Amino acid sequence: FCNNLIKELLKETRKEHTLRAVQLLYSIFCLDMQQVTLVLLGHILPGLLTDSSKWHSLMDPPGTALAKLAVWCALSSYSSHKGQASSRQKKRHREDIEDYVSLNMRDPLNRVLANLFLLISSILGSRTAGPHTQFVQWFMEECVGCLEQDSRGSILQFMPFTTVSELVKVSPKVVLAITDLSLPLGRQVAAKAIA
Amino acid sequence: QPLLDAVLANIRSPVFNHSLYRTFVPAMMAIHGPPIVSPVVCSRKRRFEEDERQSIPNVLQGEVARLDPKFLVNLDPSHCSNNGTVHLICKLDDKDLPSVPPLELSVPADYPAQSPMWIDRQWQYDANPFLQSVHRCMTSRLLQLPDKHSVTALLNTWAQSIHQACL
């Protein structure tokens, strides 16, 4: 469903139409927010970033809408949501571990978001970036938003700090994102953002 | 002189080159009959693993690591971590006055690279007249370098200019 949707999406070739498209699409994704957003964050983003065949699509200005789409659905999912419908509660019993290798809880949405962010940081690596550098740029840009609470950024041995350090080479945007709770961990990224 | 055999032997150019066997290997087997040509253990293994995974071709690091202890080379935030991997920060430590480190961002190993770009040129150089003269002598000597070589020529010329600063 979402695959064919995003496939039909990249045809406008004009920012306004793509904007209206993603605007209507965020709404059409309602009534199934949890599972739809899970499947999206799990497949549709790696489905283009992991390989080069689908990289061709990511170069489009629709890519900015796709980034906006991703951050919007992530924010909506992380936010409080009951979503209890008859045709949904009667069909909300499956099994999935997501095989999310770890090399503040155990929740499918949170784990999928962590895996997604890890893959973002990995794609942010060097030695190849034609289309996806702009993708992660737009992602980080649209992620910046007031009244938001996503991008928790665990601070044990994780990428987000090095990720922000690298994104600084593409000024104070990440200087605000990484500042989770003014913890001593944030002192490092603050010093790096001092420049 | 005995070239009659040459062209007629060269006649057998096309793909069906098997009859040569029936022409030579019996007579060969008369004189040379060796079963022991390569009986030792032998097997073809094309590749096992091949990648740098740490930096550019080794030659640059291998050569720069051989420099004097008077120079102190390090790396800035990795904005070209894999392909470029060249933006050096150096600290002259000797019997001379210290100064600002250079940029030193090079190109592929062909080395048509005047690597330093002086990212902090303006404000760091407008500070004092002495270091301004140092910079002037630096750029004047760099212009004199014909096809400069980032590996050694850059740091050597910079050290020479820093040692020329004492007038």
Add this chain to the structure above:
Amino acid sequence: METQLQSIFEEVVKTEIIEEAFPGMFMDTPEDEKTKLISCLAAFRQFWSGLSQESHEQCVQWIVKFIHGQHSPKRISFLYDCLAMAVETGLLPPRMVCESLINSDSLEWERTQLWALTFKLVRKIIGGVDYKGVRDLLKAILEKILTIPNTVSSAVVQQLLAAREVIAYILERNACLLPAYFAVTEIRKLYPEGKL
């Protein structure tokens, strides 16, 4: 003789000397920012006043060819300073140098440093007082950018981005610099009613 002029310019600019093995301090102390640049400018202006004013298109082509025949980014920048000074002196109007430089020496993603310095020159000369006949150079620039591949690299991004900076400056000053309609129509080589 254009070759004689090139050799004279080389002698005036190239000053190759001994290996400087013997350490000598007081040998060469010229003010390159005000003395050598002005001397080169004066010599080139005398040669310009000599002859071939209108026909100086092929002459400037020869000049830029000789400039890009080198391999020292520092030397290229030093030469570019003299070109800028000549612009302020009035010689080499922006149209000529812009139309010549963009072709035959772009070296697409070949010499990153050269690419960057050339586009820095374009950004500097972006003033370029010119009539409605200015869209041609924009079209040629975009055409030269389009030849760039899709996955060239990840390290050299900022240096190549200078082209994007020039385009941004142009299309943003278009609010006050050049006609918008012409800028839009120049995208015909890339915009057939929308083709990614």
Add this chain to the structure above:
Amino acid sequence: IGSLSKNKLFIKLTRLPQYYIVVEMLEVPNKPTQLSYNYYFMSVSSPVMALLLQQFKDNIQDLMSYTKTGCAFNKVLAHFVAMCDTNMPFVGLRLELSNLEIPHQGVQVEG
């Protein structure tokens, strides 16, 4: 250009690649002696007419004597006729290595 001068040469580097004509700055101001021993280097051979510029420390080499840590001043002169004896060969090698790859010349191992 100058006046009555002297000249020295060498063999150890090559037969006669570059001579060395030198002359003291005669007629010192208010001094019957101490002609300050001016120095100038040349690089003619086929006698070339390229620049000479006195590429070495001419004539601040005197201040190089004061750069030491401690009856005749001859100590300076030999230096010149010494340094060429080991300097001019190496650059020639550069011209030979200027054809294969990496002509990184003039490097000094640890001083």
